[PDB]
Design an enzyme around this catalytic site. Structure first.
Site, short mmCIF file in Angstrom:
data_model
loop_
_atom_site.label_atom_id
_atom_site.label_comp_id
_atom_site.label_asym_id
_atom_site.label_seq_id
_atom_site.Cartn_x
_atom_site.Cartn_y
_atom_site.Cartn_z
N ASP A 9 0.84 -1.20 0.00
CA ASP A 9 0.00 0.00 0.00
C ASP A 9 0.87 1.26 0.00
O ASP A 9 0.61 2.22 0.71
CB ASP A 9 -0.97 -0.01 1.19
CG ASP A 9 -2.10 1.02 1.06
OD1 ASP A 9 -2.17 1.75 0.04
OD2 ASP A 9 -2.93 1.12 2.00
N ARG A 66 -0.11 9.20 0.54
CA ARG A 66 -0.98 9.35 1.70
C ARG A 66 -0.52 8.52 2.89
O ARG A 66 -0.87 8.85 4.03
CB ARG A 66 -2.42 9.00 1.31
CG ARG A 66 -3.34 10.23 1.13
CD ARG A 66 -4.70 9.86 0.48
NE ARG A 66 -5.80 10.77 0.79
CZ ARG A 66 -7.04 10.38 1.06
NH1 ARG A 66 -7.39 9.10 1.05
NH2 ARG A 66 -7.97 11.30 1.31
N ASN A 67 0.29 7.48 2.68
CA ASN A 67 0.77 6.65 3.78
C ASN A 67 2.15 7.05 4.29
O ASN A 67 2.76 6.27 5.04
CB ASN A 67 0.74 5.17 3.38
CG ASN A 67 -0.68 4.64 3.32
OD1 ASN A 67 -1.49 4.91 4.22
ND2 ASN A 67 -1.01 3.90 2.25
N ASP A 91 2.25 3.77 7.55
CA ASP A 91 1.32 2.66 7.52
C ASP A 91 2.02 1.42 7.00
O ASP A 91 3.15 1.48 6.50
CB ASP A 91 0.10 2.99 6.66
CG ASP A 91 -1.00 1.98 6.84
OD1 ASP A 91 -1.01 1.30 7.90
OD2 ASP A 91 -1.84 1.84 5.92
#
Ligand code: A1JNJ
Length: 256
Positions: A133, A137-138, A151
């Site tokens: 992922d 955004r992480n 994350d």
């Protein structure tokens, strides 16, 4: 141990919404550090053990890694309400920071963030950990010169073709998704393939199309990105190599 007594935690301003609930900042009062600034992830639905299970897996996994460009676990509170306490990154998620810092950040700094990210992913690779992922955004921003992977955990527009067709996820998928993230950074946090139906994205990759060279992005970086996007996963580079090339790109950019 990693369990923390709710009395040593002072909840403060809400700093973001996560998969599972609000994310807060706050203070952790330990004897080793009387006032430590921390982040608190909360879990809205964690009365359900199935949710609690998935929420707290994030902390079990964080606990295994020790890297300068990967966020660190402080502890957990497992009775209701369930909380994860982790290091605070005071400038928030990378995507917003890029958006708001447009016109303010220079090229070397954008390269610095990608290289820093690659060192975190080379480390995870050395541990045989597939992340699955990787997206702007992480990533979190600790300072103007320090970002961190925040994350561990559908994002079709970021995923490798074999992830979409075979639900297959490997170090080589990670490399692909990291090419997209680099693109995201050189675009100051514009999402890939905006306004494009997910299902149409796969055909266009199969057609051979790729994300455009961003403005102000150097040919050497774009060339790096396009190696990440080899359709066959076995032609894509390893993060160890990406790390070395981005190191050279950064030394030369610093030179202007
Ligand atoms: O919105 C989120 O998901 C979010 C926002 C902030 C943080 C954070 C962790 N440490 N420092 C900041 N984590 C997740």
């Amino acid at each position: 141990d990693y369990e923390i007594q709710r009395e040593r935690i002072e909840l403060g301003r809400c700093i973001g919404e996560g998969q599972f609930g609000d994310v807060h900042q706050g203070i952790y009062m330990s004897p080793e550090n009387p006032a430590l600034a921390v982040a608190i992830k909360t879990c809205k639905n964690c009365t359900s053990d199935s949710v609690r299970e998935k929420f707290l897996q994030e902390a079990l996994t964080m606990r295994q890694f020790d890297h300068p460009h990967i966020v660190k676990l402080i502890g957990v509170i497992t009775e209701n309400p369930v909380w994860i306490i982790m290091e605070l990154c005071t400038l928030g998620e990378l995507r917003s920071f890029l958006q708001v810092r447009k016109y303010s950040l220079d090229l070397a700094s954008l390269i610095l963030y990608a290289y820093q990210l690659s060192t975190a992913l080379a480390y995870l690779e050395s541990k045989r950990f597939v992340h699955r992922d990787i997206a702007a955004r992480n990533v979190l921003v600790s300072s103007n010169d320090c970002v961190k992977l925040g994350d561990f955990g559908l994002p079709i527009k970021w995923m490798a073709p074999e992830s979409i067709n075979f639900r297959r996820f490997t170090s080589a998928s990670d490399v692909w998704m990291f090419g997209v993230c680099m693109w995201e950074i050189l675009m100051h946090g514009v999402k890939p393939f905006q306004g494009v139906k997910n299902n149409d994205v796969i055909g266009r990759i199969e057609n051979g199309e790729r994300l455009p060279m961003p403005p102000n992005c150097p040919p050497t970086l774009y060339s790096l990105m396009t190696k990440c996007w080899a359709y066959d996963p076995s032609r894509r580079p390893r993060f160890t190599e990406l790390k070395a090339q981005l190191s050279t790109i950064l030394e030369e950019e610093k030179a202007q």
